[PDB]
Design a protein around this ligand. Structure first.
Ligand SMILES: C=CC[C@@H]1/C=C/C(=O)NC/C=C/C(C)=C/[C@@H](O)C[C@@H](F)Cc2nc(co2)C(=O)N2CCC[C@@H]2C(=O)O[C@@H]1C(C)C
Ligand SMILES: C=CC[C@@H]1/C=C/C(=O)NC/C=C/C(C)=C/[C@@H](O)C[C@@H](F)Cc2nc(co2)C(=O)N2CCC[C@@H]2C(=O)O[C@@H]1C(C)C
Ligand SMILES: C=CC[C@@H]1/C=C/C(=O)NC/C=C/C(C)=C/[C@@H](O)C[C@@H](F)Cc2nc(co2)C(=O)N2CCC[C@@H]2C(=O)O[C@@H]1C(C)C
Ligand SMILES: CC(=O)SCCNC(=O)CCNC(=O)[C@@H](O)C(C)(C)COP(=O)(O)O
Ligand SMILES: CC(=O)SCCNC(=O)CCNC(=O)[C@@H](O)C(C)(C)COP(=O)(O)O
Ligand SMILES: CC(=O)SCCNC(=O)CCNC(=O)[C@@H](O)C(C)(C)COP(=O)(O)O
Ligand SMILES: [Cl-]
Ligand SMILES: [Cl-]
Ligand SMILES: [Cl-]
Ligand SMILES: [Cl-]
Ligand SMILES: [Mg+2]
Lengths: 203, 207, 206
């Protein structure tokens, strides 16, 4: 009962909104069930993952029941130039320069992009490398995620600046202990009214 | 005398700059005459009004003699998820979930977008829901209008941050008292030199 | 030895990255050699220079060995309305309104855009009119360059906000004194290892 997490186009007539997990073809992208991307021009979610080279080996991770707004892009670590001296990538143009190859140790690598569950990412959000976003958080439109985002907090702007927390410090502990996105689907369905309207305490 | 406010493409040869009023087909959009949109790629002004659902009933109201720059978008209220608990729009995917439908009282609805007259909205500006922007203001390119914008003030950034007021308080009080955009068109042409070169005192003398 | 600065597509198979200098067909668009533009869908670098009217005469000047990222745009001075009174460009619509034409002394003109050498401009950067950006600087992706950028400083945001200086003051003084981008090309290849890894003690020595 509920849509098929493995069905790419779960909304009839709607060719723009896609469940991400079934469309992932490149490795190192790990997107949980039911998370979706609402595309501007109907293009694939993978087209929004930028500068993702297999040699650098970083991953992009997203949990379940995330909504990702149209135009959101993910700047993977391969985008960063070397910074010890000249940023110019001489080795790319070869003809004698190909022998000046940086290695992983020579680059400002920053780790994985880790986004939790039930995250609402707005429209045209740009996500910088190595960033961690917590569960239940809300990124505003046009945001540029430049620091980590705490669970169940609202953020937005460029550079990212904190706005507020969604619930009292105690109530957030409740959602994080609940972890409904992991509960058995037969159980999630029995409780969706409360997951949706926020009355968590009824469980 | 002057161009036709009702002519979609008022510049010869130009196919991107459009007078908005005559193009409006969909409801809950009220743009005043002579306001125009400079398109990036020929896209219509309405193409730039996003998440506008007739079921939510919010409106986009723009005044007269406004210049809305290429790529500007208007995030209407339908864009906001419910925020009591999970922000995930379960009901959209149906298959039993379609009964978990929110009501208007359940959503974070913030009211209309109200834009004044003689407003210069820059290129690639995102306007958030429920925002008011006063007469004669100037929105910098690439801005994200997140709070109200006072009349005859320059603003820009993401989030929106205040830069400066265009004229002194006493001078802004006069332009708003004047309201040159509402005068009969026979009178706007008679004073167009002074409307253009900022001479509120000369207009005062002729009023 | 090294690629041809005059070859439009210097990377085999790649059809998006282009050396800018050989792809300029208009005057007052001075980009130094080896500077390149990595395009989103194959658009040219000039396509990204907006509101550039020859009647206004401002120029866009970019140095050498610069990396201008996909989607960057350069707002030239023609973009600014007149701000004495109504910002509405009546004259454009003609039919009696063309007689109300502004002059150059009537517009908020701010001068050329001057970008230095070895500058890393990130992806989707907007550059406002009249701005200067110093040598070796790094502009973060999605930035809106609204004020000048000092040499060898990292900046980003909207509006632009200062992050940090790449090296100590004494070290930046040296790179600017050095000016490795202006040296003869026979010498740049001889020191490329140290230009790349910033062995300034070795560079001064040589
Ligand atoms: C272990 C370190 C990987 C190492 C290169 C590192 C390096 O120089 N990284 C700095 C990044 C520079 C960027 C993103 C520059 C943009 O301004 C233009 C490019 F986007 C154009 C373009 N990139 C590619 C092809 O075309 C391209 O293939 N790459 C870009 C970085 C990763 C990859 C590459 O050359 O990896 C090498 C592999 C093969 C040993
Ligand atoms: C009285 C409240 C109206 C109520 C539901 C409102 C509601 O759930 N609003 C939250 C907004 C969610 C958004 C913007 C989610 C994006 O991540 C993806 C969507 F954009 C994709 C998409 N939207 C639609 C079709 O496809 C779509 O039809 N709608 C989106 C909001 C309005 C409308 C809708 O479901 O209205 C209902 C009517 C019909 C009973
Ligand atoms: C010595 C001063 C030059 C003078 C007028 C300058 C002037 O009024 N500048 C203010 C800028 C207004 C802008 C950028 C308005 C946007 O909202 C829509 C336009 F982009 C649409 C559009 N522009 C054009 C054609 O279509 C267009 O031809 N121009 C725009 C500014 C330069 C140029 C122009 O009118 O130059 C005149 C010459 C020819 C006598
Ligand atoms: C996933 C989608 O496509 S929804 C599109 C994006 N919407 C937004 O980013 C709206 C931003 N709104 C806010 O930040 C408001 O201040 C809010 C606190 C949520 C009310
Ligand atoms: C309506 C159009 O297409 S004009 C294109 C957009 N131009 C802009 O937004 C430039 C922004 N400039 C500023 O904010 C400056 O600081 C200003 C005070 C106006 C000089
Ligand atoms: C020229 C290209 O295409 S590179 C693509 C754009 N990349 C960026 O702008 C990344 C921005 N990163 C930062 O500002 C970081 O804080 C940094 C100090 C460089 C690490
Ligand atoms: Cl790329
Ligand atoms: Cl993009
Ligand atoms: Cl939409
Ligand atoms: Cl233009
Ligand atoms: Mg900011």
């Amino acid at each position: 009962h509920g849509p098929d997490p493995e069905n790419i186009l779960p909304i009839k007539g709607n060719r723009n909104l896609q469940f991400i997990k079934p469309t992932i073809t490149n490795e190192n992208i790990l997107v949980g069930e039911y998370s979706y991307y609402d595309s501007k021009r109907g293009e694939s979610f993978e087209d929004q993952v930028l500068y993702h080279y297999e040699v650098i080996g970083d991953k992009l991770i997203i949990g379940r029941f995330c909504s990702i707004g149209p135009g959101t892009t993910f700047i993977m670590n391969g985008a960063n130039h070397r910074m010890d001296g000249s940023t110019y990538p001489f080795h790319l143009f070869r003809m004698g320069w190909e022998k000046y190859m940086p290695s992983l140790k020579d680059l400002p690598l920053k780790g994985d992009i880790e986004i939790g569950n039930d995250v609402w990412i707005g429209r045209d959000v740009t996500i910088m490398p190595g960033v961690k976003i917590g569960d239940g958080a809300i990124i505003a439109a046009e945001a540029v995620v430049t620091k980590n985002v705490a669970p169940y907090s609202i953020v937005g702007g460029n550079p990212l600046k904190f706005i507020r927390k969604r619930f009292s410090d105690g109530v957030i502990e409740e959602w994080l202990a609940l972890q409904w996105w992991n509960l058995d689907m037969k159980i999630i369905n029995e409780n969706l009214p409360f997951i949706i309207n926020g009355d968590i305490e009824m469980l």
